[PDB]
Amino acid sequence: SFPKYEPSRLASLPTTLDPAEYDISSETRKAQAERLAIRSRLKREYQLQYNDPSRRGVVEDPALIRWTCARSANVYPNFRPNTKTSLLGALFGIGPLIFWYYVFKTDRDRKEKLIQEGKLDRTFNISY
Amino acid sequence: MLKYIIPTMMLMPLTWLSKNSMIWINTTLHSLLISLTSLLLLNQFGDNSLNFSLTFFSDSLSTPLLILTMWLLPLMLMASQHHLSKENLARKKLFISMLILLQLFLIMTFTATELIFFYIMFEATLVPTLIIITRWGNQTERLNAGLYFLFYTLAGSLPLLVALIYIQNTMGSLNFLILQYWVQPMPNSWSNTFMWLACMMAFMVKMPLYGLHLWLPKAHVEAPIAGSMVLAAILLKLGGYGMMRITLLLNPITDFMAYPFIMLSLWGMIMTSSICLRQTDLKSLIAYSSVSHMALVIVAILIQTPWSYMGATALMIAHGLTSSMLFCLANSNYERVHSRTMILARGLQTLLPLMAAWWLLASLTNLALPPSINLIGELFVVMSTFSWSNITIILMGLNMVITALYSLYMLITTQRGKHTHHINNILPSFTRENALMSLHMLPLLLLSLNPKIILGPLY
Amino acid sequence: SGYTPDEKLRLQQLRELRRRWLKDQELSPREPVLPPR
Amino acid sequence: ITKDMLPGPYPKTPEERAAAAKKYNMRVEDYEPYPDDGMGYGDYPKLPDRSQQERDPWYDWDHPDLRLNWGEPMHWDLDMYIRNRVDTSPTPVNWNLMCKHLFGFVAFMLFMFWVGETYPTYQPVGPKQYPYNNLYLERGGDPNKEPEPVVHYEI
Amino acid sequence: MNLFSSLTLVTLILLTMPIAAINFNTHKFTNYPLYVKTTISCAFITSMIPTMMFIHTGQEMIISNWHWLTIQTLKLSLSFKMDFFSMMFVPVALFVTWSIMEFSMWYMHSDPNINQFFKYLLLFLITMLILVTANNLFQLFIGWEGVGIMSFLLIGWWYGRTDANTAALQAILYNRIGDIGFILAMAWFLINLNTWDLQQIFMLNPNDSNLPLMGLILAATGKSAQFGLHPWLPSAMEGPTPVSALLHSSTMVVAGIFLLIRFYPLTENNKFGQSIMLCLGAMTTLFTAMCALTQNDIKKIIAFSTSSQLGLMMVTIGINQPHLAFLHICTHAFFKAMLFMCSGSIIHSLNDEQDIRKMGGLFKAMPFTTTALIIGSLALTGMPFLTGFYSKDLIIESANTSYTNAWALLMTLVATSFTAIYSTRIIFFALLGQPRFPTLININENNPFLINSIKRLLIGSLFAGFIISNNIPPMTIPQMTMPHYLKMTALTVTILGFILALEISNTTHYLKFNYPSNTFKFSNLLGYYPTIMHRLTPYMNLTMSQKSASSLLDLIWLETILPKTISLAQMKMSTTITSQKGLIKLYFLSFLITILISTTLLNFHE
Amino acid sequence: AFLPSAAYLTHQQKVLQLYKRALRHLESRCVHRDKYRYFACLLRARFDEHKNEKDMVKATQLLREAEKEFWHGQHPQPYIFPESPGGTSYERYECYKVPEWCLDDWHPSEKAMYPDYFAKREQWKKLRRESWEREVKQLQEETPVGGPRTEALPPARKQGDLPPLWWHIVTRPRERP
Numbered sequence A: 001s002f003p004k005y006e007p008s009r010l011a012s013l014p015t016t017l018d019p020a021e022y023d024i025s026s027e028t029r030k031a032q033a034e035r036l037a038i039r040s041r042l043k044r045e046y047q048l049q050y051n052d053p054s055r056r057g058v059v060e061d062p063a064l065i066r067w068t069c070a071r072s073a074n075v076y077p078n079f080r081p082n083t084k085t086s087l088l089g090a091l092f093g094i095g096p097l098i099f100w101y102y103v104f105k106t107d108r109d110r111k112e113k114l115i116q117e118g119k120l121d122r123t124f125n126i127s128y
Numbered sequence B: 001m002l003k004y005i006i007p008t009m010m011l012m013p014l015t016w017l018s019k020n021s022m023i024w025i026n027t028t029l030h031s032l033l034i035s036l037t038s039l040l041l042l043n044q045f046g047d048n049s050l051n052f053s054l055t056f057f058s059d060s061l062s063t064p065l066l067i068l069t070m071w072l073l074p075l076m077l078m079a080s081q082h083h084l085s086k087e088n089l090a091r092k093k094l095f096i097s098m099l100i101l102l103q104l105f106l107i108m109t110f111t112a113t114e115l116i117f118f119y120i121m122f123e124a125t126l127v128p129t130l131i132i133i134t135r136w137g138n139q140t141e142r143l144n145a146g147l148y149f150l151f152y153t154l155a156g157s158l159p160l161l162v163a164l165i166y167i168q169n170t171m172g173s174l175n176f177l178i179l180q181y182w183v184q185p186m187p188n189s190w191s192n193t194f195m196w197l198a199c200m201m202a203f204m205v206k207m208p209l210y211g212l213h214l215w216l217p218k219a220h221v222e223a224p225i226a227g228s229m230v231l232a233a234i235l236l237k238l239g240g241y242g243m244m245r246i247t248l249l250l251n252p253i254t255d256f257m258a259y260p261f262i263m264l265s266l267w268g269m270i271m272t273s274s275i276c277l278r279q280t281d282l283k284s285l286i287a288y289s290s291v292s293h294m295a296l297v298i299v300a301i302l303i304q305t306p307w308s309y310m311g312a313t314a315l316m317i318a319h320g321l322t323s324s325m326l327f328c329l330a331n332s333n334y335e336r337v338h339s340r341t342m343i344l345a346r347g348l349q350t351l352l353p354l355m356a357a358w359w360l361l362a363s364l365t366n367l368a369l370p371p372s373i374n375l376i377g378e379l380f381v382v383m384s385t386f387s388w389s390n391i392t393i394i395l396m397g398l399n400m401v402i403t404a405l406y407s408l409y410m411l412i413t414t415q416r417g418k419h420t421h422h423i424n425n426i427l428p429s430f431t432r433e434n435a436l437m438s439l440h441m442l443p444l445l446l447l448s449l450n451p452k453i454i455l456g457p458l459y
Numbered sequence C: 001s002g003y004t005p006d007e008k009l010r011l012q013q014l015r016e017l018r019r020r021w022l023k024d025q026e027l028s029p030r031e032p033v034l035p036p037r
Numbered sequence D: 001i002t003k004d005m006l007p008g009p010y011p012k013t014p015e016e017r018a019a020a021a022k023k024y025n026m027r028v029e030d031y032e033p034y035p036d037d038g039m040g041y042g043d044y045p046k047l048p049d050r051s052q053q054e055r056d057p058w059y060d061w062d063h064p065d066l067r068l069n070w071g072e073p074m075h076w077d078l079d080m081y082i083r084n085r086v087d088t089s090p091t092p093v094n095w096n097l098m099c100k101h102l103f104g105f106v107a108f109m110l111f112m113f114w115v116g117e118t119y120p121t122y123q124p125v126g127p128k129q130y131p132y133n134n135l136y137l138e139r140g141g142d143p144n145k146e147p148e149p150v151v152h153y154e155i
Numbered sequence E: 001m002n003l004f005s006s007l008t009l010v011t012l013i014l015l016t017m018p019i020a021a022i023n024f025n026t027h028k029f030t031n032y033p034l035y036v037k038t039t040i041s042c043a044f045i046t047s048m049i050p051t052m053m054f055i056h057t058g059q060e061m062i063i064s065n066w067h068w069l070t071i072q073t074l075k076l077s078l079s080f081k082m083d084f085f086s087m088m089f090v091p092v093a094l095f096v097t098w099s100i101m102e103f104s105m106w107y108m109h110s111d112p113n114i115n116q117f118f119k120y121l122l123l124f125l126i127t128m129l130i131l132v133t134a135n136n137l138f139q140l141f142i143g144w145e146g147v148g149i150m151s152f153l154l155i156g157w158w159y160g161r162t163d164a165n166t167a168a169l170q171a172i173l174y175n176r177i178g179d180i181g182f183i184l185a186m187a188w189f190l191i192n193l194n195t196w197d198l199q200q201i202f203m204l205n206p207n208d209s210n211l212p213l214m215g216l217i218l219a220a221t222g223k224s225a226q227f228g229l230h231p232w233l234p235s236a237m238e239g240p241t242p243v244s245a246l247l248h249s250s251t252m253v254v255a256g257i258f259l260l261i262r263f264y265p266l267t268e269n270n271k272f273g274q275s276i277m278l279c280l281g282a283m284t285t286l287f288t289a290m291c292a293l294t295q296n297d298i299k300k301i302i303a304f305s306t307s308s309q310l311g312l313m314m315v316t317i318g319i320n321q322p323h324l325a326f327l328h329i330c331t332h333a334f335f336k337a338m339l340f341m342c343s344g345s346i347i348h349s350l351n352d353e354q355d356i357r358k359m360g361g362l363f364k365a366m367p368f369t370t371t372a373l374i375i376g377s378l379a380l381t382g383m384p385f386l387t388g389f390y391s392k393d394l395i396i397e398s399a400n401t402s403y404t405n406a407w408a409l410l411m412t413l414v415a416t417s418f419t420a421i422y423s424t425r426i427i428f429f430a431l432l433g434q435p436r437f438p439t440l441i442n443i444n445e446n447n448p449f450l451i452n453s454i455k456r457l458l459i460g461s462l463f464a465g466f467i468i469s470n471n472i473p474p475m476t477i478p479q480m481t482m483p484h485y486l487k488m489t490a491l492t493v494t495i496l497g498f499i500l501a502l503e504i505s506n507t508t509h510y511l512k513f514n515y516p517s518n519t520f521k522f523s524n525l526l527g528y529y530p531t532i533m534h535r536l537t538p539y540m541n542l543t544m545s546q547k548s549a550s551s552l553l554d555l556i557w558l559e560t561i562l563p564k565t566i567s568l569a570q571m572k573m574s575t576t577i578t579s580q581k582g583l584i585k586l587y588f589l590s591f592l593i594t595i596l597i598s599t600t601l602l603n604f605h606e
Numbered sequence F: 001a002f003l004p005s006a007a008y009l010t011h012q013q014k015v016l017q018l019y020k021r022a023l024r025h026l027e028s029r030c031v032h033r034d035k036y037r038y039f040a041c042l043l044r045a046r047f048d049e050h051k052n053e054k055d056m057v058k059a060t061q062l063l064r065e066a067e068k069e070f071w072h073g074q075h076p077q078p079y080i081f082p083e084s085p086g087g088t089s090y091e092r093y094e095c096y097k098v099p100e101w102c103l104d105d106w107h108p109s110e111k112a113m114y115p116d117y118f119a120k121r122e123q124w125k126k127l128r129r130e131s132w133e134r135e136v137k138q139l140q141e142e143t144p145v146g147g148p149r150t151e152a153l154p155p156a157r158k159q160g161d162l163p164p165l166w167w168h169i170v171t172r173p174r175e176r177p
């Protein structure tokens, strides 16, 4: 019939084409109502502070603080050197250094050989 | 040099004998007078350096660093007087004494004729900086920051000391003027290899070299505002100054000893700039941008051409002004929202339009908009590295893409979009704050009219 | 089905307060009171 | 803010998973951490990897430009999935078919520019004729030397 | 000499004077936009005098008036090149900008920051004339990055809109990718020719000019939105309509083309660079005119129109016709700025409606906008003896009768038919038929600013190709002998485009509903290039920016190998040294072991 | 899926949202008003055929293949209203929507330029700070134990009370400030 939508990492599945969107089961209703309850509690807790006349400042979000703490300070306490982190740390850490070393070294050896053999055109090159 | 050293020391009785309401005004006034006085160092010659005495000299490398150093002290006092308003009076005077003492150590770091006196002033700068960070920094991590800043330096600099004393035993002198004429070639050997590392790694830590840079996004982030201003604007440039002096003695071994470090810098400026694309802390983003900018100065000093040294000293002066202004802008938002999270306070151009114009100008100078001296230094380093190897333009040009991308992202996140609804303490910009921004930005833009004074000794 | 009566009542009261607020954004005929040039 | 509301280590026991689900303001049945492979995520939730563009724009968001509520657990790459940046929204054409069509179009055009370069068009004319030995002195030829005579005839 | 150089510098200083006025102000201005518009009309009048005395004698000069900086053998001076390119581009840019600003006094009247808008628009004009009047690469780079930054600030004019900020940063990103090639060219010319001045570049005339011309072609690909670096120009329609009319149609986006016209003594001796420019321009003019066939936002259609015209300019550079390319710049400025101004008149009369599916019936309701839109669409498609005829028809005749990549010629002709197709798409959905806009009609174009600003570009779009093409000196030999099917190629292809798209437009009224094909979805979703490349390339960068660079290296491994392992080692050695049980017996037993190792094992007693 | 009051969409709400999306995409495909009007009546006839369907599994199946029908037949560039999300004028004026609290930071010389406005602003501020404690104690005497279930707020129940959490709804900026 119709071409089936193939979702990707950068093009997700639509809400209207997802089979779990049409679940009418009571456990999904309980999960949706419990998510609505958490969101309504956080909403009320936010807008009781947001609408306060005496408040003058920043309504601190512990979710934002929690995110910025996870992105920076919690990383090394939760690092374990294993096969994955060592093979990724050495591929992306010293791999490009070896690569650009051999590229620039081969280029400058070739250019130095051409200059000392009098082959590189260096006719008007006096700024360096 | 003693016409600058003695007024800088006279700032100490000036701050300790001032009336309690006058200690910012008096030190600001007389440090501005010292900074006006610093232009007499522009008596530079096309052949000779300005050689005052046996102890002090000033060529066209040290002179702009001195003028920038003496200029940064009033701006640090203006930046720091607001958040230290509730401080004890004696601790306030001790803070100003640490800034004065740091200026005193810096101005005879840059003018030290002899290299071991350079070493002693160079390492003497650590103690006021460590005290400022660990005593007047805001958070817990300042203590850990004070350790990293202390121990990446000394572990690099204690082999330098030995190396310098070895030169003292070999050449008979560490006078830089004598070493200009008595320099002997340094051949390929293992002894000269570790001689090269001992001469270079302390300054590699100070720049910082990529991979050795980890002290900086703790030390510049956890510092107070004057600490971050002097760390980014001056103390990184002790490494570049020291390299430009010390690589006289390291030829011709540098021609292959530079190859790893150049790689560490050329890829490192790709890494740290990319890191700036995903920084959530604004002050950390400015710190990583400093690592990325100093990577070019490392490459330019290691390839040691005239164009590269001219670009490296122009880029050091330009980065000093730009990074100090960027830390002051980030502090002006921190002193309102009390968080360094960049995504927190958004849409600030709707609330603070003139400060948004300062953000715009500092971002444009950060991305090296021509004809700023940022672009002059950037471009001259790119010319010299293209002559070094034509492939470097890839890693150069890609850097200039990413440098634009994090500069405007910082400008788009904080200034543009919708303002945060729940933040209602965004005060209008104080005259002190706009003054601080203009005293960074107006000299930076006026140096584009006459950039030859910041092009160094081989202009 | 449309609103609940609580939603109708809350929107009516917010509507009255909002229209009072928007009426209070009009200037007086003397405003803006400028300094003498 | 305090210590038991900050992120911590990876949750192993189910009561630790429950209390860290309570910390990030979300259900235990919805809380999934990143897999404990030592990359440094800790107990931080693996949220479903969607852009903020996919959020409902008509909802009363606390942060309307970000489409994000207060207290909602932010994605690890929230600064990456802002609407200024990476969009993951569903596309009218499938991703693989888009890649096939774009690559096929670009490759076909480059191939046909190569073909037309190998077989160029021209006009049924001879070469353009210039006097004075094909303008030898005008093109920068030195006057002390003398070139071969380039002679053009009438036709 | 003294008249020429003085009025040359008076034009530029006069443009800088309202910037000095707005920066030195205390009051609320009595119509600062009128002052900037009066200043630019006067700069047009002042720039016409050196233009006339170039038309008289061919009088050219270089004003190297301020020595700025000598880097040992590179003397950098503030140097202005008053040649044919500056002498024609400066009056055309000033005339177009004067119409854009009298349009902006109407279109931006509700804007509370209209003085900042006119300040930014004048700063763009100053940086653009710095670009086109420059004699060295550093000053050209100042103008180049300056028009990039004013493009950023004017695309993101409504800065609370996320799409405006995204489009502005996208324009920056693609132009910095081109600036890689610009700085490559500057590096090559400095290292190999010891200069950034154009005169020493042209006098040395290097034969190995592959790499600097590849850099210049990359710079033009960024700046003129050629294929690969194209989508920022349709994204740049997020800015206000005078920004799209001034910068992104007529003045800024030709700068890359202008750059390759400025280096024509190098491109004329490099057949490889000519073939690269030819294939790149033909690719661009096919692809963007194909994308324009199915768009519905009127500014997107005009943006793909001007990127197709920039592709045509790149084609006529690639066939070694740089003066026809410059003629097409000066010609294209008039009618394309006027087409954006007519679109903005429609958008303002329909309450910021920009989709052509909610237009229609505007033939009689907006008669002056209709007249000027039809005249501009005929000038765009190369109606005979309108302004686009005097450049584009010569471009097609020269591309036919030359030693050319035949696929590039054929794609240029298919793009020429596509121009007629999207031009009548504009005329059909915007002007013809019956209304599709909402019921409260606020249609009004009776402002003197709107009428006069469209009127001067209308007189331009009628007569400027004739006047310029009869005033400029011959710089090549025009090919005027060709067979009848090859002389009549452009007109026949344009007429076939009009006929075929009349068929396409009349099939829209039929009561048939077909599912869209893959060709329609390829044209409509922009060849899938901004969908893939703007999702995939940021993703792979930003993950790499956080996972590898931030987390793995500079929070973990560069933290692990130097400081953390050293600290753990010194902690472990500290705990081994200080784990002594306080027993005198064990310490003296260690002293005995010390003496035995010193005597027997180390021989410290010999 | 994601709604402030309801926890989900009902089947009837899903059908009506599909019907509106399908008519808007059909109008994008079918530009002219008579041609749209014909095909919109045909689409309404397709929706009225299965309107009286009592089997909810059959109705859910019809809704699911109708969503597949829509996803195949949608317009690649549908018409978006200009101030609507994704529109060309969406969130354009947010840079001009200065919040009201910034008026508290004005200098007295520029507050004196608008005497009647700020005199009228102060009685709004007085009304808000005398209404705040009554509306907080209204919310806490009406929210059940464990927190609110939905995000709906109650109205004012007494004569003299204002609705709870009203200030940023009432004093929000204009769409054209």
Ligand SMILES: CCCCCCCCCCCCCCCCCC(=O)OC[C@H](COP(=O)([O-])OC[C@H](O)COP(=O)([O-])OC[C@H](COC(=O)CCCCCCCCCCCCCCCCC)OC(=O)CCCCCCCCCCCCCCCCC)OC(=O)CCCCCCCCCCCCCCCCC
Binding pocket: B353, B354, B355, B357, B358, B360, B361, B364, B365, B369, B370, B371, B372, B373, B442, B445, B446, B448, B449, E022, E023, E024, E025, E078, E116, E123, E127, E130, E139, E142, E146, E149, E150
């Ligand atoms: C030795 C004597 C020297 C005399 C000449 C001066 C030389 C330059 C010095 C520095 C000048 C900067 C001062 C203005 C900017 C900062 C303050 C500000 O924003 O005020 C806004 C305010 C007006 O705005 P507003 O409406 O009231 O409020 C602002 C809004 O909130 C919203 O604001 P906004 O965003 O709408 O408007 C900001 C706008 C934003 O616009 C931009 O950001 C776009 C700019 C970039 C693109 C366009 C330029 C590209 C490059 C071309 C120009 C350079 C080369 C030109 C030569 C030909 C080609 C080679 O910026 C401007 O319009 C400023 C115009 C000048 C820009 C200079 C370049 C900055 C870009 C970044 C670095 C680029 C390289 C360095 C160039 C250095 C050249 C010397 O201006 C003032 O009130 C000015 C106050 C007085 C300024 C004095 C300047 C000199 C100070 C030096 C003192 C000592 C020497 C004595 C000389 C005194 C002369 C009078």
Ligand SMILES: CCCCCCCCCCCCCCCCCC(=O)OC[C@H](COP(=O)([O-])OCC[N+](C)(C)C)OC(=O)CCCCCCCCCCCCCCCCC
Binding pocket: B152, B155, B156, B159, B162, B163, B166, B191, B192, B194, B195, B197, B198, B201, B202, B205, E566
């Ligand atoms: C910031 C972290 C990294 C810091 C790196 C600092 C530099 C790294 C290299 C330092 C080497 C040691 C000092 C060398 C001084 C050179 C002086 C000289 O004349 O050398 C030639 C002399 C030669 O001896 P000589 O000169 O007496 O002999 C006469 C000359 N010939 C050889 C011809 C007969 O070299 C040496 O004597 C030894 C040099 C190597 C020393 C090896 C031991 C130290 C290893 C490195 C330790 C680095 C720091 C470790 C801590 C890290 C952090 C906790």
Ligand SMILES: CCCCCCCCCCCCCCCCCC(=O)OC[C@H](COP(=O)([O-])OCC[N+](C)(C)C)OC(=O)CCCCCCCCCCCCCCCCC
Binding pocket: B371, B448, B449, E065, E066, E067, E068, E069, E076, E077, E078, E079, E136, E138, E139
């Ligand atoms: C409204 C104010 C205007 C002036 C009002 C009062 C005067 C009234 C009218 C009389 C005119 C004044 C007398 C004549 C002027 C002075 C003439 C003279 O010899 O001046 C000495 C010199 C002329 O140059 P010079 O070659 O003699 O000296 C330069 C100095 N050395 C040699 C050391 C390099 O300086 C000037 O004139 C300075 C003004 C320059 C004007 C342009 C400024 C552009 C700024 C751009 C900054 C960035 C550039 C980067 C790019 C550069 C290119 C790559």
Ligand SMILES: CCCCCCCCCCCCCCCCCC(=O)OC[C@H](COP(=O)(O)OCCN)OC(=O)CCCCCCCCCCCCCCCCC
Binding pocket: B394, B397, B398, B401, B405, D083, D084, D085, D086, D087, E163, E166, E167, E170, E173, E177, E180, E217, E218, E221, E227, E228, E229, E235, E530, E533, E534, E535, E537, E538, E541, E542
């Ligand atoms: C003559 C030769 C001609 C050669 C032509 C072909 C060469 C180039 C090939 C393509 C490379 C560039 C294109 C890919 C990057 C494009 C990035 C971009 O524009 O992203 C836009 C994206 C959102 O835009 P969009 O979704 O369209 O907006 C709709 C409203 N939400 O916005 C975002 O997602 C924001 C992301 C910000 C960070 C971007 C990180 C990526 C940076 C890539 C740098 C590449 C450098 C290449 C260097 C080459 C050196 C020679």
